[PDB]
Amino acid sequence: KETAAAKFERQHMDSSTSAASSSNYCNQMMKSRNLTKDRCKPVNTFVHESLADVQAVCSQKNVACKNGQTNCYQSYSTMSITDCRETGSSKYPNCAYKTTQANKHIIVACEGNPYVPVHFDASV
Numbered sequence: 001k002e003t004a005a006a007k008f009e010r011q012h013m014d015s016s017t018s019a020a021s022s023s024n025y026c027n028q029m030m031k032s033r034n035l036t037k038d039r040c041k042p043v044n045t046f047v048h049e050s051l052a053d054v055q056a057v058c059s060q061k062n063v064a065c066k067n068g069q070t071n072c073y074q075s076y077s078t079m080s081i082t083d084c085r086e087t088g089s090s091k092y093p094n095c096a097y098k099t100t101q102a103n104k105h106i107i108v109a110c111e112g113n114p115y116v117p118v119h120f121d122a123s124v
């Protein structure tokens with residue numbers, strides 16, 4: 001039974017690569033992180049920075065989350081990310097994703113002690 005912080009790591013961290021270098025990156029990563037078990041998760045972002053750099057965002061710019069909560073933080077610098085989004089021809093169990101690599105600021109919600117990311121809100 002997964003902690004919120006561990007779920008964030010599984011869904012959103014990929015420090016092992018600097019960027020998505022292939023159109024099939026999302027198909028592979030969404031499957032290997034178990035995000036296509038039982039359903040195709042429609043949208044998911046992977047961050048290509050160290051865990052420490054992503055955890056550090058919880059001490060950066062405090063901003064509102066989309067849902068109105070005030071525990072969101074925007075990274076001061078841009079970060080390498082990959083957005084994964086289901087295509088129109090995707091349907092479980094043959095989930096299919098579009099891969100879009102970008103360099104953007106990330107916005108995360110933080111909670112707990114230690115105070116770490118638990119939700120990926122957006123990128124800018």
Ligand SMILES: [Cl-]
Nearest residue numbers: 010033034035
């Ligand atoms: Cl898992």
Ligand SMILES: [Cl-]
Nearest residue numbers: 043044045120
């Ligand atoms: Cl996401």
Ligand SMILES: [Cl-]
Nearest residue numbers: 060061062063
């Ligand atoms: Cl401020």
Ligand code: NA
Nearest residue numbers: 003004005112
């Ligand atoms: Na947690």
